[PDB]
Every structure is written in C-alpha cells, then in structure tokens.
Write a protein that binds this ligand. Structure first.
Ligand SMILES: CNC(=O)c1ccc(O[C@H]2CC[C@H](NC(=O)Nc3ccc(OC(F)(F)F)cc3)CC2)cc1
Length: 336
C-alpha cells in the first residue's frame, strides 16, 4: 500500500464518529494491511488534531495495525463540553478507554500512542486502565508524577519555577480564546504555531508569553505545514463553535481539577508503575517539553525504551520518517 503521509481527506482512511461517555467523538480509522496485529490508538495534543498523526497512520497501517486516531475533547468534530471536569486527564483517559474498547471489545487490549497533551493522556490512561494498555508510547511528553500538592501556576512562575510553562497562563486566560476567532485569525494562529516568522524574525509564539498577537499580522508561511495542510487545520478548527479555541484551551484550565484527582491517587491509590512495554521519544529542540525534563522517569517503568529525535516540538511530522522508524522497531520487539 501507499505509506506516504495522509493528505487532507485522504481516502486511505475513514472518518467516523461514536458516542463516547456522553460526547460525540470524531476519529480517523485506518484499517490494517493484512490480518490485524493490534489496534493502535493515537492521541494528539495542542494545538493539533487527529490529522497530526498523518505520518504515523498510513505507516502503522502498512505494518498490519488497525489505527484509531480521535480528535480529542474540544478539537474539530469532537464535542467541547462546557464543564471543565470533562477535560481532566482521568475523564479523558476514560474516554480513550471506552473508545478503544468499542473496537477491541471490553476484554481486548490496544497499543496506545500519545503526543504533547496526548502523551500525558496515554501515561495516565496506562495508569488508570492497565487491563487495556498492552503497550504505550509517548512523543515529547515525559511522565509526570501524581500531584501530591496543588499550587497556582502564577505563584509557581512567580517564584521562578516551571518557566517553560509560563505560556499556559495566557492560554488558560481570556486573551487567546477571545482574539483567535474565525478562519482568518486561525490561519495566522496556525502559521505562528508551526514555525512561521515575521519580516524581522518575529515569532508568533513563545513558551514565555504565549501567542504574540502583535505579530500574527506579519506572520509568514510556516515551514512545518504546507498550504494544503494549513488550510485543513483551519477548516477543522472552524468546526468548533465560536470562540473556536475554547475547547482546546480548556486543556490548560484543569490544573486544580487534575490536582484533586491525583492528590487522591497519591494518598490512597496505586503508585505510578508501568509494567507493560513503554517507549518515550524525546525531541531535542522542544522548548516546551525539553528532554532534560524526563530525568528520573525510568524508575517508574519495568520496561521503558528511550529514544530521542533531533526535531522541534512537531516531531511527528518534521521527523515523521524517523519517528515512524523508532515506533515500528520498538513495537516489533515489544510485541515479540
Ligand atoms: C516532569 N514532568 C512534568 O513536570 C510535566 C510534564 C507534562 C505535563 O503535562 C504536559 C503539560 C503541557 C502539555 N503540552 C503543551 O503545553 N504543549 C505545547 C507547548 C507549546 C506549544 O507551542 C510551541 F512552542 F510548541 F510551538 C505547543 C504545544 C503536555 C502535557 C505536566 C507536567
């Protein structure tokens, strides 16, 4: 079959929805070449969508995998509930668990892949539902411990800590949600998020201040999306009701809710312990999730495979062929 990356509305895959835990969940479904080895569920992050796995979906299909890549909660054709507790890692993990079992049955198992916020989802999903996750990998996103304590992010960065996360203050606030509405602003927003630059090298986004609205006017062609792919992101993000980015930005408004769930797990529940085979693909030039952030991550895993790729945060695409290689070979050993 054709293993080249998915094009917008590629006919090699199917585009379906299912009711999942009260929400409409849109997803990409790719059927395997040959008898199904495993079902692989891929979870994207912010500000991405299922199409963000366009390099991995046809590749994993050609390896004999069924591939389910949902548009996560708040993105594209998937519902964006008003309630913030729907956006916790626990609830979203339960969404992935019910969606995965809608294909492999309640007794079945899956391979689970995540990137950015999706990588955090799949670690938590492997933690909450070990019966389901036969193998799990995450690109860029390392494991983070069960929250033992809640502190406002303002106070954390005010003390000089977690400075690589200070962009989240703007994202969770009203500025990005109010100003990035309609396709015209979405097109500039995506040009900024995927590497576009201004006449004097102005970046449209930074990990310190977030979106630079002052710059989106002069933001140029992004090096990491072609014109067809950029228009697809705009079209799919336009499927959300205005303000279109409320759903995606809701993922940055759940620090306290996630803290309340995991402060319970830290006290009573089982520890962060991964017995199934695991892979972590770090990205060298990811300024949001730097490789050094994964320092003592190996201690939580019985079987963690480490790899690192010289790429930006957008390693699934910028280094799609290399990421495909790391996944396929690790998957080949992890499954036998
Ligand atoms: C030791 N581990 C920890 O402390 C820890 C790890 C993960 C975690 O959850 C993370 C939070 C961040 C979220 N992703 C995100 O914000 N991505 C993002 C950023 C910036 C962008 O713009 C860019 F600059 F990249 F172009 C585009 C996407 C993933 C899960 C919490 C704690």
């Amino acid at each position: 079959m054709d293993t080249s990356k998915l094009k917008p509305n590629d006919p090699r895959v199917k585009y379906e929805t299912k009711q999942i835990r009260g929400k409409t969940y849109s997803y990409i479904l790719g059927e395997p070449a040959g008898p199904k080895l495993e079902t692989v569920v891929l979870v994207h992050g912010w500000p991405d969508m299922a199409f963000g796995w366009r390099h991995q979906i046809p590749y994993l299909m050609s390896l004999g995998f069924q591939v389910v890549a949902p548009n996560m909660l708040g993105y594209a054709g998937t519902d964006a509930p008003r309630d913030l507790s729907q956006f916790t890692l626990k609830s979203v993990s339960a969404d992935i668990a019910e969606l995965a079992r809608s294909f492999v049955g309640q007794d079945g198992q899956i391979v689970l892949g995540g990137h950015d916020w999706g990588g955090a989802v799949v670690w938590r999903t492997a933690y909450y539902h070990p019966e389901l996750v036969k193998a799990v990998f995450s690109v860029c996103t390392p494991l983070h411990p069960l929250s033992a304590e809640y502190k406002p992010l303002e106070d954390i960065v005010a003390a000089g800590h977690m400075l690589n996360f200070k962009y989240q203050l703007q994202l969770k606030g009203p500025d990005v949600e109010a100003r990035i509405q309609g396709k015209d602003m979405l097109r500039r927003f995506f040009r900024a998020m995927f590497g576009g630059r201004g006449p004097n090298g102005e970046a449209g986004f930074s990990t310190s201040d977030g979106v630079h609205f002052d710059v989106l006017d002069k933001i140029g062609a992004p090096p990491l999306l072609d014109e067809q792919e950029l228009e697809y992101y705009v079209e799919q993000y336009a499927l959300q009701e205005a303000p279109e980015l409320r759903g995606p930005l809701n993922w940055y408004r759940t620090r306290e809710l996630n803290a309340k769930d995991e402060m319970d797990r830290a006290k009573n529940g089982p520890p962060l312990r991964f017995e199934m085979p695991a892979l972590f693909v770090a990205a060298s030039k990811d300024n949001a999730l730097p490789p050094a952030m994964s320092k003592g991550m190996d201690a939580f895993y019985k079987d963690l495979t480490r790899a690192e790729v010289d790429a930006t945060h957008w390693a699934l695409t910028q280094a799609g062929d290399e990421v495909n290689r790391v996944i396929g070979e690790w998957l080949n050993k992890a499954l036998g």
